[PDB]
Structures are given as structure tokens and as C-alpha cells.
Design a protein around this ligand. Structure first.
Ligand SMILES: O=c1ccn([C@@H]2O[C@H](COP(=O)(O)OP(=O)(O)O[C@H]3O[C@H](CO)[C@@H](O)[C@H](O)[C@H]3O)[C@@H](O)[C@H]2O)c(=O)[nH]1
Length: 432
């Protein structure tokens, strides 16, 4: 078989979409080796069934308690991203040298678009290099314009809706890391003309004009959603799906702020009271390190009547469940795309980076969500109003119909003859 190496950035919103692409490629007969940091591997709980080799490299940055890579990295982003980069260059080189003692020999390296310098490692090692963008073409275009200097982070950019300042990717939220973060985002396009394959986790129908514009510059391959319609980490699948199977159609608010965003105790309380004083069933993912900021008896007592509070869930299976009526989300791109492809309208509570832009696209372009309005805390009353809008109002019925329409276009994209299916086949055939 042809041997593909895959190197996501060490965060779940980067690992997961690449993992799903890898599972698709493995189904077509390719051998896959997934490259993870030690810290990522510590959280991997199931891997046997996917048949993918997992090889680990050092973190390359300090190990601070049991915190995640980006958490440590945020203490000093400019220094620690550079340390992560230098260590990853050296250790991916060493790992490829070792893999070259085994058959089948590696032939291609799919790497996260946020680590463009991995292209030089792939080419030095005689491999093809494929840059895998985990953000939509619309937001990625902003980073391209940042690299060209057309914009520095009302705003008008080619083939995007008119944006308010709050709609731009949120780099200011990173405080003394804002400048480093803006440079790393722009740098995704620094070597794009030398990449062997440019892959985006999106589908053409979702952003026709920006994809077309992008394609006028470089051959790009839209391959999304890579997610099927599955997990490396603990997802508490049995507890979650049995609770959802007890819920009636269209009754559950799914609530998640993803793998990284952490709300203050003050914000947690407003979300908590909003969910309670709404009278809806809710499944709220509160990561284990964030639990201690919940109200005193929320998890054990107050949420017991209508809520399931869980430290992680099988999000693809949850969003596919008929009981789910809407998705209160931080609007990370994976959650955004997974909800659209599942036909689930959202309540948008973006926190930083591309989430702000994603929320604007959700509400104003794809029209499958509403956005909370901050006061900078989002108040329980605002959340409750958004819940009624989606759950009870005529508008929410329109958002749901729009979400089902996108689900159908996404199904077509990944089915035989669809744009993403065609592009994955073109990629596979090229490797052959
Ligand atoms: O209980 C859960 C919650 C989430 N997920 C999955 O976790 C991932 C979350 O990804 P995402 O929605 O993209 O949010 P983040 O966790 O914040 O990660 C991303 O946040 C931004 C998304 O665009 C990007 O900068 C990067 O891809 C990455 O940092 C998705 O695959 C989810 O399906 C679960 O499986 N179970």
C-alpha cells in the first residue's frame, strides 16, 4: 500500500478533522501513520480499531501539570511556538528516518496548515507535502489577505460579507500573544505555491465564490466534511447516547464550547441559570478541568431534572441524534461544519480566533443560527431569548429548514459524484 503520514497540530480541533480524513483514506487501502505529541498521546484512549499506526514525538515545550499544549503555549506564544516548531522539525525528521527502515516506505506527509515549515521537512525527506486547512476557505482568505498586507488585525474583503470589527478573527483576545497569533495565521500562506496539495475541510457549495477565487490562484482540493456524515479520546458514548434515546425529537439543547475555550465562573453561572430557567433538556459538555467553575450544586443536583453534564461526548453521534433541537456552540469550525452537515441550527457564542467570523457566517450567510449579544458578559436573559428564538419562534423553524438544506448539500458533496468525493479521489489517484 501507499503510506501516508499525517501530522496535525496538537489540539483536538486539528487532530479530529485530520483523523477523519485518514480514516477515509485508510478505507481506500492507504496505510496511515499518525504523528502525535507525547501530551496528545496521554489523552488517547482508543486506537486499536482504526488500524492506524500512532507514532509520538516530544512536545518540544514545557510540561506544566496536566495542561494541554496550547495552554502551555499561551504562557509565551512567540517563544513556545518557535520551540514547538524547532523540536517538531527535528523530531519529525528523526521519525521519518526511522519509518524509512520499514515497508511500506512513506510517500506523502499531510500536515496541518498552521505548520507550513513542515513542507521543507517533507521535501527534504523525498515526500510529497499536503497542507491541510482546518478552517473554511472564507476565514482562511482573511489570513491570506493579512499576509499580502491588504488588512492588518466596517471591513470589506473579496467574496466575504461586509464585516463589523467584532466579526474579524479574534486575535486581540490573546492579549500579549495577539501579534504572534496574527503572524502564525498569516504564515499559513507563506509557501502555498510550493505545496504539492492544498486541502480544505469544506465543500464547494458552502462557499462557492471564495472557493472559486481561491482556485483561480492555486489548485485547491475541498475535501470536507472529513467527518463521517470515529474518536481517539474518551467520549462517554454509552452514557450520552442512552440519555439522548430517552429524549423526544427536537427537545434537547446541546451545549459545548469545544476543547480549548474556558469561560469564567461568572459566565458559567449565566449559562447555567439560562439553561435551568429555560425549561429544556440539555446536554452540556463541561471539560473536567472546567467543572470546578460550575455553580456549587449544578452538576450533582440542579441539573439532574433536565440536564446531562458530561466532560466529553461523542459529538458526531450527538449532533446526529433526532432529539437535539439546537446547538449552543463557541463556533469552532469543526463544530460549525458538523452541525450544518447534521442539520442542527445553532446559538452562537464565539470566544476568539476564527469563532467570531464563523458566527457571522452562521447567522448571516448560511442562516442556520443566531448570535448572543454581549453586555463583556453574556447574560442569562440574552441566552434565554436565543433559546426561544430557535426552539419556539417561527424564525427557528426557518433556521432548521436552512440547516436541513445544508445537510443535503453536504451529503451530496461527500457522495459519489460530489465535489468533495471527486477531490478525495483526485488526491488518491494523484498519489497512485
Ligand atoms: O464533547 C465533545 C466536544 C467536541 N468534540 C469534538 O471537538 C472538536 C472541537 O473542534 P472545534 O469545534 O473546531 O473547536 P476547538 O476545540 O476550539 O478547536 C479549534 O478551534 C478553531 C476551530 O476553527 C480552530 O482555530 C482550530 O481548528 C482549533 O483550535 C470537534 O471535532 C468536536 O466534534 C467532541 O468529540 N466531543
Amino acid at each position: 500500500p501507499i503510506h501516508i503520514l499525517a501530522f496535525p497540530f496538537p489540539a483536538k480541533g486539528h487532530i479530529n478533522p485530520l483523523l477523519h480524513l485518514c480514516n477515509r483514506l485508510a478505507s481506500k487501502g492507504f496505510k496511515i501513520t499518525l504523528i502525535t505529541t507525547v501530551s496528545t498521546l496521554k489523552s488517547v484512549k482508543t486506537s486499536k480499531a482504526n488500524g492506524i499506526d500512532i507514532e509520538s514525538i516530544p512536545d518540544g515545550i514545557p510540561q506544566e501539570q496536566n495542561h494541554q499544549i496550547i495552554t502551555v503555549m499561551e504562557m509565551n506564544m512567540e517563544l513556545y511556538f518557535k520551540q514547538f516548531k524547532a523540536s517538531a522539525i527535528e523530531n519529525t525528521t528523526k521519525l521519518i528516518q526511522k519509518l524509512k527502515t520499514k515497508n511500506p516506505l512513506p510517500k506523502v506527509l499531510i500536515y496541518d496548515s498552521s505548520m507550513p515549515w513542515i513542507l521543507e521537512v517533507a521535501h527534504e525527506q523525498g515526500l510529497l507535502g499536503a497542507s491541510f486547512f482546518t478552517q473554511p476557505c472564507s476565514v482562511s482568505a482573511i489570513y491570506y489577505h493579512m499576509l499580502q498586507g491588504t488588512i492588518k488585525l466596517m471591513v470589506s474583503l473579496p467574496y466575504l460579507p461586509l464585516l463589523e470589527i467584532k466579526d474579524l478573527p479574534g486575535v486581540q483576545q490573546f492579549e500579549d500573544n495577539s501579534e504572534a497569533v496574527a503572524e502564525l495565521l498569516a504564515d499559513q500562506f507563506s509557501n502555498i505555491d510550493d505545496v504539492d496539495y492544498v486541502l480544505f475541510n469544506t465543500f464547494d457549495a458552502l462557499e462557492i465564490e471564495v472557493v472559486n477565487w481561491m482556485g483561480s490562484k492555486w489548485p485547491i482540493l475541498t475535501v470536507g466534511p472529513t467527518a463521517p456524515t470515529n474518536y481517539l479520546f474518551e467520549t462517554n458514548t454509552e452514557v450520552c447516547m442512552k440519555w439522548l434515546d430517552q429524549r423526544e425529537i427536537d427537545t434537547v439543547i446541546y451545549v459545548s464550547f469545544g476543547s480549548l475555550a474556558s469561560l469564567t465562573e461568572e459566565q458559567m453561572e449565566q449559562v447555567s441559570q439560562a439553561l435551568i430557567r429555560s425549561n429544556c433538556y440539555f446536554l452540556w459538555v463541561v471539560r473536567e478541568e472546567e467543572e470546578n467553575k460550575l455553580p456549587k450544586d449544578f452538576k450533582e443536583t440542579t441539573s439532574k431534572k433536565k440536564g446531562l453534564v458530561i466532560n466529553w461526548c461523542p459529538q458526531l453521534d450527538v449532533l446526529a441524534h433526532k432529539s437535539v433541537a439546537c446547538f449552543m456552540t463557541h463556533c469552532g469550525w469543526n463544530s460549525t461544519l458538523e452541525a450544518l452537515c447534521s442539520g442542527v441550527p445553532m446559538i452562537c457564542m464565539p470566544q476568539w480566533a476564527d469563532q467570531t467570523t464563523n458566527a457571522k457566517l452562521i447567522e448571516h450567510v448560511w442562516k442556520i443560527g443566531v448570535g448572543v449579544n454581549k453586555s463583556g458578559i453574556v447574560k442569562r436573559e440574552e441566552i434565554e431569548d436565543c433559546i426561544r428564538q430557535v426552539i419556539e419562534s417561527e424564525r427557528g423553524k426557518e433556521l432548521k429548514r436552512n440547516a436541513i438544506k445544508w445537510k443535503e448539500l453536504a451529503k451530496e458533496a461527500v457522495s459519489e459524484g460530489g465535489s468533495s468525493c471527486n477531490n478525495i479521489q483526485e488526491f488518491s489517484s494523484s498519489l497512485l
